[PDB]
Write a protein that binds this ligand. Structure first.
Ligand SMILES: COC(=O)C[C@@H]1N=C(c2ccc(Cl)cc2)c2c(sc(C)c2C)-n2c(C)nnc21
Length: 109
């Protein structure tokens, strides 16, 4: 049962990586680089960082038990962005645009 659901999860993540969503999805592609961004307090506020490439690696390695574990990592990635940044920040608006894509596809599986 879980194997079919995880095939759909890979399909959702692939769509999140598509050129169609690139203008707002690009900050979530790779882990937040605290050194390059100069984010001295990021590791103190964000205990469990997450990004799309890490989620892709976990799916490839068959690390997820089911679809809800995949869903939890995607939501964690968005939660970290909302937590660290004030609500008027552009990255927050981009996270919400990409979450609308994830939430739509995920609710249909
Ligand atoms: C000063 O605070 C930041 O730089 C936060 C950082 N902003 C951004 C960010 C992203 C897009 C815009 Cl338009 C402005 C800021 C960011 C990432 S990852 C990444 C490669 C970047 C450029 N990000 C995520 C995800 N969560 N917070 C951020």
């Amino acid at each position: 049962s879980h194997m079919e659901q995880l095939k759909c999860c890979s399909g959702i993540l692939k769509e999140m990586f598509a050129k169609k969503h690139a203008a707002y999805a690009w900050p979530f592609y790779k882990p937040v680089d605290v050194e390059a961004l100069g984010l001295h307090d990021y590791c103190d506020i964000i205990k469990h960082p997450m990004d799309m490439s890490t989620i892709k690696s976990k799916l490839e390695a068959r690390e997820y038990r089911d679809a809800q574990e995949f869903g939890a990592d995607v939501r964690l990635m968005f939660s970290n962005c909302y937590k660290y940044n004030p609500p008027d920040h552009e990255v927050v608006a981009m996270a919400r645009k990409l979450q609308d894509v994830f939430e739509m596809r995920f609710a249909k599986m």
